[PDB]
Amino acid sequence: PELFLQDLRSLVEAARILARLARQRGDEHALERAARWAEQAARQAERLARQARKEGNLELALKALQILVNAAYVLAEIARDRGNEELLEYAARLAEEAARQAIEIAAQAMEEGNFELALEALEIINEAARVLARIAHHRGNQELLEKAASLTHASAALSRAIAAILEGDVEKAVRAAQEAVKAAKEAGDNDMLRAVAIAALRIAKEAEKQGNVEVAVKAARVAVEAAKQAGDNDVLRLVSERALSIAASSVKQGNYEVKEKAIRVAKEANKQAG
Amino acid sequence: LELALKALQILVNAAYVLAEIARDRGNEELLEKAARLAEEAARQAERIARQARKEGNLELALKALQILVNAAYVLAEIARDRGNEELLEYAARLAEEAARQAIEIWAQAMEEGNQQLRTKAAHIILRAAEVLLEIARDRGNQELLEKAASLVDAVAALQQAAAAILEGDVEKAVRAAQEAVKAAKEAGDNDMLRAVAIAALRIAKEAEKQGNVEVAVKAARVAVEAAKQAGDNDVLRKVAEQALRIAKEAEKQGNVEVAVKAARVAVEAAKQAGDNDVLRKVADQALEIAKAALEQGDIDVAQKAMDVAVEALTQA
Amino acid sequence: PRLVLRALENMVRAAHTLAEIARDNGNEEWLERAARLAEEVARRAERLAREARKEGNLELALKALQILVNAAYVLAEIARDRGNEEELEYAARLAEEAARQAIEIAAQAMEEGNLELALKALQIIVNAAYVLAEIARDRGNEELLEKAASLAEAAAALAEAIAAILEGDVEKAVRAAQEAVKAAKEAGDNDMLRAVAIAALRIAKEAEKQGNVEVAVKAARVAVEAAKQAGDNDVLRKVAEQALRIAKEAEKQGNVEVAVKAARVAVEAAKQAGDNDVLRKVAEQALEIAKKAAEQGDVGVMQKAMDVALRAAGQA
């Protein structure tokens, strides 16, 4: 199967070269060839990318999303010099739902603790943010550029939090999570907020694994903040469950104040869930 | 063995950095030294590629070509501010010979069915064309634009055809192949046409397994269009064997009209090859086709079959 | 380990995107954010790189250096458009220090005999030279520009020498090494000189396997030429031990002229080092060389063996 992506890449490269050549040598049918080749390759990639989530090979899926971003760069190059906004709008829609789908993949990877895939999906997100910014630079949307700065900020924050978790540097992780929830507030996207909450959950799970219940309460206080801003009841349920983990762990550590905080956090999560 | 390519890549990268460092400064001696570093690396890489091709490790060979293409890119980047054409004259000729060798590698990979080399070789050829295009962008040679564009769109067709082969879509395969010969014939590159023809054999081999002889003859009609330029006698005999096999399948299907068109392709090739054993086999097959056309009462097809049979047999 | 490298690299890649976006928009605050992120990564990556060498895994270490070089590239891209000298100074310091550590890796790698790691480190060094030069041009400092260029040339010669070490042409290796000492002596970089000497030692070890003591001495003549600039006492000791090993083989070959030249190198090095055990071991062998020069009846060679042994002993 995998060779499909390599061939798609080659067709994208051919399109890139043809576009480069066409900026030297005048032929609108070179532009039309390259656009048709590229769009068809992108749709072929999209079919595979949709299939890959059913197949569960997320590695091939995020590789296909990298192809989509790389193709989107070439599509944007063609479109911006050809001077057509509808093709930019198409490329933008392609990139936007691709990146949103990457955010879903990243949430699964962080739930698994399969941080390998999370870092790679975050890379796809970075490169998508690059391509989105290139499009926005020609459309004039300062709002999208602020969102790109926010998206790159948030993906960096997720990366930093992941690094602190892999290191076990949990106070720095809690500090980084406090930065991350502000970055999510800058972004204003519920799916990013979900990914950040899933990170905050996984962060608290590491503190529970350590038995550092007070660090876990700090992590949970961020997690429930993210979940409260997101409004997702399944996240709020998972947060309430983890808060009861922390509460039981706090009684196991023999401290009533950390129990009291953990119960108040569980009750905040329950109050938002209704 | 392998480490030499890694070192050479580092040498080319070092030359690139040296050239970039020198670029803003009045020191053509640094540029000359960088060019000497690049030339030695290129001479090493060509010698390695020659030997690796003899040994049959195509991955080492194509990686050496990748390095050489990067070296050509560096040589052009040196040559521009130097105002020197002779460097470009070396680089373009070297890049053309590299592209030829990469196309020959691509043909061997297609013949052997090694998709894994095919992708790599395609990327290499595409990069080679990009470097030729940078050279053309500076130098203004319009023929090099035609060469580059046609090479690239021909690789894109070759890739599309390989994708169609993996998908089993013989109609897509024909659609692509028709454009592939269109590009390659406008280029006039007989080695590109050879690679196209070798791919067309693989198209025919799978088209028989699919059993759609009506599409397969359109593919064979493209195959001879290229093969008639290239003139490689063993390739022509291989093509003729495939055309006869296609005719045998068309008889099993009872489609004598497609069988006669398959013979019309077969004679066009056999008339170049001159192989009397092909002429004998063509006449024998044509008589079986005439027998089928008689049995069907398709006598316009029978007379067309025997017109082609006479046209073939008269070459003896 | 592995994940943290990936993550920090991704944090640099994120800073690279953020800097692109910020420069496209013309915004300041996003650069300030990026700079804070990049500095935090630089501080973390320095720790990681220092720890990785203490763990003995040079590959993890050199990858961490490549992260630092990516960070330096981003920091420079920010700083040179930001327009501040202290930022450019800090970036230059970071890149230079990373290059020092990279050469320390390269020295250790060649001393162990893993050219693959050394080649990787040379790519890191080449990258650092590019970054340093881009800083130095935009800052305006010809000394650092010349330093970058000369370092890059010396790196290129070292890469060529590594290629020659793979190939086994010891004359080519010496030809490269002559240019390598030329660049290194013009640069005055202690670690570059150390690296050249270590390479020359392994060149000599291969020349001994081949039995080519003559070219081994030519390599050693470069080795002392470099070592005499730098005073690496243990490298001088290794050079002297090699010179005695070479002299013992030259005695076994009966080439007392090459043996006396090997002693002539050994005393030149020992005169810098002042190591009494080396001096006495050298003089001990120098009388074996004089003994064989007398057995051959070579008057001028025995007069040289006299002159060397006596000058070696005369203040030891």
Numbering used by the authors:
A (entry chain d): 1 to 274
B (entry chain D), C (entry chain N): 1 to 316
Original authors' sentences:
Here, we describe a general computational strategy for designing multi-component bifaceted protein nanomaterials with two distinctly addressable sides. The method centers on docking pseudosymmetric heterooligomeric building blocks in architectures with dihedral symmetry and designing an asymmetric protein-protein interface between them. Functionalization of the two distinct faces of the nanoparticles with de novo protein minibinders enabled specific colocalization of two populations of polystyrene microparticles coated with target protein receptors.
We used this approach to obtain an initial 30-subunit assembly with pseudo-D5 symmetry, and then generated an additional 15 variants in which we controllably altered the size and morphology of the bifaceted nanoparticles by designing de novo extensions to one of the subunits. However, if the dihedral interface is instead asymmetric, the resultant pseudo-D5 complexes could not assemble until two different heterotrimers are mixed, yielding bifaceted nanomaterials in which each of the six independent subunits could be uniquely functionalized. We refer to this pseudo-D5 (pD5) architecture as (ABC)5-(ABD)5 to indicate its bifaceted nature and hierarchical assembly from heterotrimeric building blocks. To design bifaceted pseudo-D5 nanoparticles, we leveraged a 15-subunit substructure of a recently described pseudosymmetric icosahedral assembly. This ring-like substructure, called CrownC5-1, comprises five copies of a pseudosymmetric trimer with three-fold symmetry at the backbone level but distinct amino acid sequences for each subunit (“ABC” heterotrimers). A previously designed interface between the A and B chains drives assembly of the heterotrimers into the 15-subunit substructure with five-fold rotational symmetry, leaving the C-terminal end of the C subunits free for the design of an additional interface. We docked two full-length CrownC5-1 assemblies against each other by sampling rotation and translation along the five-fold axis to generate 30-subunit assemblies with D5 symmetry. We then used ProteinMPNN38 to design an asymmetric protein-protein interface between the opposing C subunits of each dock to generate sequences intended to form bifaceted (ABC)5-(ABD)5 complexes. The pseudosymmetric, 30-subunit bifaceted nanoparticles we described do not, to our knowledge, resemble any known naturally occurring or engineered protein complexes. We note that even though we only displayed minibinders on the B subunits, all six of the subunits in the bifaceted (ABC)5-(ABD)5 nanoparticles reported here are uniquely addressable.
